[PDB]
Amino acid sequence: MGVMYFKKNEFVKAKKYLKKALEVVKDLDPSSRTTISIQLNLGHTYRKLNENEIAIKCFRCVLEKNDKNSEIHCSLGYLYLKTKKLQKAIDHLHKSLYLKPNNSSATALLKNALELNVTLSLD
């Protein structure tokens, strides 16, 4: 139901129903494609809502739960790229490209990160 309301670009009831789903399933389903999926979708909804703060933490906890995933790394790099933390997102992009071969959108994001790094002159 949350993915439904995310597709229609409502971005509100989707978040509400997904938070209800996770709070129902806080105790159980520690692993096995349920907590990861629900938390990733809530973080994805928050990125669409521009509330990047809680999104960084939720993506981080998903990442520490399971490391081998290109999508989570790509989205975390996207989140960091939304702010100015290029030093901490390029490593994520490189590891994401390491995990999965092509990742065309990730390649574009990494390239733009290179032009950003080239432009900037931090000490």
Partner: protein, 35 residues
Amino acid sequence: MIRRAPTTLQLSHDDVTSLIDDLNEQKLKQQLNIE
């Protein structure tokens, strides 16, 4: 009875390209102020 993987979606191409374009806007305008 078995459940498959539930539907999850990742960053699309349209939104990521829009963010790329925006990044070029704020990496294009600021050096005009510097210059």
